Amino acid sequence: TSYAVVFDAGSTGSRVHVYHFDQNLDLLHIGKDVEFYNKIQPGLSAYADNPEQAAKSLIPLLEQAENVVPEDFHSKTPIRLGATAGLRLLDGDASERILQAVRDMLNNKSTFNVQPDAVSIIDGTQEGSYLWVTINYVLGNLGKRFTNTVGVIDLGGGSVQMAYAVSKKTARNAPKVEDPYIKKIVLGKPYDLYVHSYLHFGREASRAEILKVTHGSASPCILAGFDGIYTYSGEEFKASAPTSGANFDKCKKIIQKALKLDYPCPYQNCTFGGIWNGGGGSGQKKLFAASSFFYLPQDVGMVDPNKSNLKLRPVDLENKAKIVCTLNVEDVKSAYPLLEKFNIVPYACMDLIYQYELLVDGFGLDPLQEITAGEKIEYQEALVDAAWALGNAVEAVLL
Ligand SMILES: Nc1ncnc2c1ncn2[C@@H]1O[C@H](COP(=O)(O)O)[C@@H](O)[C@H]1O
């Protein structure tokens, strides 16, 4: 049996996952769970001007990990920290000072197996393949023909990933390009994954793309009457509803423009912004949609918000938007407390139309196509986090 410890140092906070794999690479319970997990805030990126404190911040998590894993396993336990690409946007050599600060700490403070490559910037493409491993691991799909694996889409704050397995033909014919479109992984059985990560098309990031389309004027993607400013990655965007409030049809046309559906496509078929769509096919008919594809439905009463996933169809998002887009900020706040908690009430109509467009016009999903959206996925009686962590533990372990 191996344990594995994967830190996820994203933009808002740092999380640790710990799994215990049995001899046949199935998960063993750790206490009552199949996954151990704690988070802290803020994220590494808050310590740009104090990188030492970024490493020191992780101390507790490391210590939960050190404790959660019996001492007897430590020397042989892989500890990996994957930080989000957000870090590269820090001025100067901060990015690397922070990693280095993490490296030092783990070497000084960890009793785990800390290899020289434990601490890296992960990036969207790898977030995508790993997530695909997380989900097909859990579902019992590894070792199946690619045609019976489950596609994954992940909507994070800044970028959205699509990853799904393709045919030998498709892989050998994939265009050339800057992240490669194909990621060859063996799991045993060799898989060719289409992988693409779209920067600027994450949940938070999308709004900036969408808001830019109307520039300093009112956006019919903003609910009546919010009159304000949306800040993303330092940049400010006026978010004022028109006189008559949000409007589904006008917003959709803005979202479509913002997606660059008409960007010219040098390949067989594109999604948007010139990106090869990967050819589609059977590796893509079943989909698991993570993170914000779940959080939005959870937040607008599309599923019991105690639950952690739901089967839905894109059209359900459209129909919700049709409703939400006629409401004012007061109604929305009242109806959808979760949207108040995250500060996104004025974005309600936009986020729904956005997820509909991304999925249907963007990715070419049939709007009557049921998909699973979830932040966790069921493994036996328990839940695992629908995140890249398990997939990266799984690949670290197969080594
Ligand atoms: N209901 C929600 N609405 C919006 N964001 C959420 C919700 N639940 C969790 N999140 C965010 O998911 C993010 C993960 O992104 P990262 O920090 O890059 O790993 C966290 O920053 C959370 O704030």
Side-chain angles (χ1 to χ4, degrees), residues 50-71 73-75 77-78 81-83 85-87 89-90 92-96 98-108 110-121 123-167 170-171 173-175 177-182 186-188 190-249 251-256:
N50 193 352
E52 182 158 69
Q53 192 51 54
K56 290 171 144 43
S57 87
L58 307 175
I59 282 179
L61 296 179
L62 178 65
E63 285 292 354
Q64 277 175 254
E66 294 280 346
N67 285 358
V68 164
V69 189
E71 297 298 329
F73 298 86
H74 282 206
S75 68
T77 292
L81 179 147
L87 268 194
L89 302 177
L90 271 13
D93 68 328
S95 145
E96 203 29 83
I98 278 175
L99 296 178
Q100 194 46 56
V102 167
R103 295 219 175 76
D104 293 351
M105 182 271 292
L106 299 177
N107 286 298
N108 288 346
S110 184
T111 71
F112 280 136
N113 204 334
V114 53
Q115 309 301 52
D117 68 336
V119 177
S120 59
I121 296 303
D123 88 43
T125 281
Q126 289 155 215
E127 262 190 307
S129 40
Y130 290 149
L131 170 75
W132 183 102
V133 182
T134 295
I135 302 297
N136 287 277
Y137 177 77
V138 165
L139 288 173
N141 283 348
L142 302 181
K144 290 198 192 155
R145 318 181 178 270
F146 83 88
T147 60
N148 298 301
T149 56
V150 161
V152 305
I153 327 167
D154 192 19
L155 184 56
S159 79
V160 57
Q161 283 87 45
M162 171 70 74
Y164 60 94
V166 300
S167 77
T170 301
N173 243 297
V177 80
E178 171 269 313
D179 293 300
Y181 282 117
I182 302 293
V186 182
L187 295 167
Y191 285 106
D192 291 303
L193 300 195
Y194 168 92
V195 284
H196 192 75
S197 179
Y198 298 82
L199 238 301
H200 311 139
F201 289 108
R203 178 90 169 269
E204 333 244 52
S206 71
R207 295 190 198 111
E209 302 297 308
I210 286 164
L211 280 176
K212 192 50 142 292
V213 172
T214 45
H215 293 98
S217 340
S219 178
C221 292
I222 295 307
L223 305 182
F226 175 67
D227 187 24
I229 296 297
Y230 179 72
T231 308
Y232 177 70
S233 162
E235 189 172 5
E236 292 189 296
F237 299 87
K238 302 247 274 229
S240 183
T243 288
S244 53
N247 180 270
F248 180 76
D249 283 322
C251 182
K252 159 187 288 193
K253 298 170 187 185
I254 291 177
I255 287 179
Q256 292 177 325

Side-chain angles (χ1 to χ4, degrees), residues 8 10-13 15 157 203 292 295 298-299 338 342 344:
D8 167 15
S11 70
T12 47
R15 307 91 198 197
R203 178 90 169 269
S292 250
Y295 299 142
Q298 175 181 43
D299 290 355
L338 290 175
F342 302 93
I344 52 163

Side-chain angles (χ1 to χ4, degrees), residues 40-50:
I40 65 177
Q41 296 179 105
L44 289 186
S45 77
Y47 303 97
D49 281 333
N50 193 352

